Amino acid sequence: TNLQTFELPTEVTGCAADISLGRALIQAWQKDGIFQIKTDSEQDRKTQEAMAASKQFCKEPLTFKSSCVSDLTYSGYVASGEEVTAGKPDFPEIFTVCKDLSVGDQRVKAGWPCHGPVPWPNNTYQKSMKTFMEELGLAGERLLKLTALGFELPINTFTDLTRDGWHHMRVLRFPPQTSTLSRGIGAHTDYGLLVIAAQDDVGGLYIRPPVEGEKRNRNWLPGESSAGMFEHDEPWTFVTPTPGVWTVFPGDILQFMTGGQLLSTPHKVKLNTRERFACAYFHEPNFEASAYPLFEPSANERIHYGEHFTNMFMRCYPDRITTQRINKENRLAHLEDLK
Ligand SMILES: [Mn+2]
C-alpha cells in the first residue's frame, strides 16, 4: 500500500484552498485511516536527533533508566513488560514526555494530579525532545485547523480546546524478535485527540483502515474496549518506513467529537529482526477542557480530558509511585474541585 502524502501550509487562514486541503485530509482518513505529511529539513533533523537521543538513553543500564521516574507526573521511564494490551504484556521500553512543569508552577504547587517536572535522563535528551515536540505541536495545530475547516466548522473549534494542551509523547524502543513471538503491541486505538507518529528505517507499525460494514467500538466507554479487535483479520496496512514524512491518524477523542465520521485508527506493532525506534506524539485538549459531540447538539456526553488521562494512567501504571501518591494524598479531589 502507498499512503497519501500532503504538504501542510505554515499558516492556516481559512481560505478556500485550506478548506479543500482539510477535506482531502478527512477523505484520506476515511479511506485509508492514515496519511503522511512531508517534513522540511529542520523537522526531519529534529526527528532524527530525538531518535538518536532515545537510542543513547536506552543503552544505559536498567538501574539508571528505572531511576527516571517521578511521584508527581507520569513522565519518565516504563520498562519492557510493564504495559499490557488486551491483558497481554507488551514489549517496548517507553519514555513518556508530558508537559514539563517546574515545582514553582501553580498547578504543581496545588498538587493537581499528573502535573510535575519530567525526570529527564540528561539535558541533551531534554533539549532534543522539547525541540521535536515544539515542531510536532505546530503541525498538530495546523492539522486541527484544517480538520475543522474541512467539516465546515469554525477554524478554532479544536484549537480552542488545545490551548496549553496536555500534549505528550511516547518515545519507544522495540526489541528485536527473540522467539516465535512477534506481537510487540497488540491491536488497540489511542485514547487521545490527534496522533502524529515518526519512526526509524526498521519498520513494524500496521494500521487498519475504515471497513465498510464493520462495527467499531467507542473505546472511551466502559465495556466497549477496542483492545484486541480485528488483530488476526485483514485489512492491515504496513506503514512502510519512508524518509521525510511523519504519519497522522485520529484518536478516540476525534472519533467521539465527530460522532464516528472519523474513526480512531486501530494499530499494532510487530517486532522486527532488529530493534526499532519510534515516537508517538499525542496532540491533546487542555487538562481542564472537555470534549463534546460536534454534530449532536443535544447530546450531554462529555470527556473531561484531565479526568480521562488521570484515570487511564492510574489503571495502566497502578503500582507506579505517581499512582501511590495520588491515592495517599487524595489528589483526585483536586480534579473534582476543578470540574
Ligand atoms: Mn498506540
Side-chain angles (χ1 to χ4, degrees):
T1 302
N2 285 299
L3 294 191
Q4 299 180 52
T5 304
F6 299 93
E7 184 176 334
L8 304 182
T10 302
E11 303 293 353
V12 177
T13 65
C15 65
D18 285 341
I19 295 171
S20 178
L21 174 58
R23 274 205 308 276
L25 301 186
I26 291 160
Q27 282 193 315
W29 280 332
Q30 290 179 330
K31 187 177 90 69
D32 298 330
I34 194 168
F35 53 79
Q36 292 170 164
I37 56 176
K38 283 186 161 177
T39 51
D40 63 40
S41 66
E42 282 294 278
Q43 289 170 325
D44 174 70
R45 177 185 60 82
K46 295 164 180 183
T47 302
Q48 300 195 44
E49 288 179 9
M51 306 273 176
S54 185
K55 183 169 190 175
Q56 188 245 41
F57 168 72
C58 290
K59 289 192 271 185
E60 298 287 4
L62 184 56
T63 53
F64 173 74
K65 297 187 294 189
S66 297
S67 79
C68 296
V69 297
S70 166
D71 69 6
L72 298 178
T73 173
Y74 285 96
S75 290
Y77 184 73
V78 175
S80 168
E82 302 202 308
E83 293 186 340
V84 189
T85 298
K88 209 165 191 175
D90 295 317
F91 286 83
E93 61 189 317
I94 314 101
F95 193 103
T96 305
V97 183
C98 303
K99 196 178 291 289
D100 190 13
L101 300 177
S102 79
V103 298
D105 181 274
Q106 188 43 250
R107 295 161 285 193
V108 179
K109 291 166 74 123
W112 291 17
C114 310
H115 286 62
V118 176
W120 296 111
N122 60 71
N123 293 333
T124 305
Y125 188 107
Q126 173 178 185
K127 167 71 155 151
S128 295
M129 301 305 175
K130 284 187 173 189
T131 310
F132 185 28
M133 290 176 73
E134 173 180 60
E135 294 276 18
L136 289 159
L138 291 168
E141 292 290 293
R142 292 161 194 140
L143 287 158
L144 289 179
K145 290 174 136 75
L146 291 164
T147 298
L149 290 167
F151 281 124
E152 296 194 356
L153 297 167
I155 188 170
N156 49 289
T157 294
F158 297 113
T159 57
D160 281 347
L161 300 171
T162 62
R163 186 163 62 267
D164 191 40
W166 197 251
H167 311 318
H168 56 288
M169 186 165 66
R170 290 166 59 80
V171 183
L172 300 123
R173 173 184 181 278
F174 293 82
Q177 186 175 9
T178 51
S179 71
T180 62
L181 296 176
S182 60
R183 176 195 177 273
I185 302 170
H188 68 287
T189 64
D190 284 337
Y191 49 77
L193 185 67
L194 180 69
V195 185
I196 305 178
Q199 61 184 339
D200 70 6
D201 61 356
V202 168
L205 177 66
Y206 292 80
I207 66 90
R208 182 174 196 83
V211 173
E212 193 64 70
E214 175 168 281
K215 202 197 137 288
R216 293 296 179 80
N217 280 352
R218 297 170 290 176
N219 186 58
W220 63 93
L221 295 173
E224 287 203 21
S225 175
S226 57
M229 285 192 53
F230 316 116
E231 184 156 318
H232 301 292
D233 290 285
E234 289 297 326
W236 288 92
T237 298
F238 178 63
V239 183
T240 308
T242 297
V245 302
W246 297 329
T247 58
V248 189
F249 55 89
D252 289 347
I253 302 171
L254 266 179
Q255 185 183 328
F256 168 70
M257 292 190 67
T258 66
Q261 295 297 311
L262 298 183
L263 292 168
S264 190
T265 299
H267 55 286
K268 64 189 184 160
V269 178
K270 191 169 46 53
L271 301 182
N272 205 302
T273 57
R274 65 181 59 171
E275 66 187 358
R276 171 176 177 265
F277 293 88
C279 293
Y281 170 82
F282 301 150
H283 199 74
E284 301 297 67
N286 192 285
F287 198 89
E288 300 174 74
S290 289
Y292 58 97
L294 296 160
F295 308 126
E296 290 176 351
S298 67
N300 223 335
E301 52 210 354
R302 298 291 182 273
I303 298 173
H304 183 276
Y305 185 80
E307 183 178 33
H308 182 73
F309 179 97
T310 300
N311 291 341
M312 170 69 56
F313 275 69
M314 289 180 74
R315 287 175 6 239
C316 181
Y317 311 107
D319 310 295
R320 202 175 180 87
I321 53 174
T322 323
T323 307
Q324 300 174 29
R325 182 161 182 167
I326 287 170
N327 286 332
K328 178 176 188 169
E329 295 181 337
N330 196 28
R331 293 188 157 215
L332 297 178
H334 294 125
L335 256 174
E336 190 180 22
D337 296 340
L338 273 40
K339 300 175 69 198

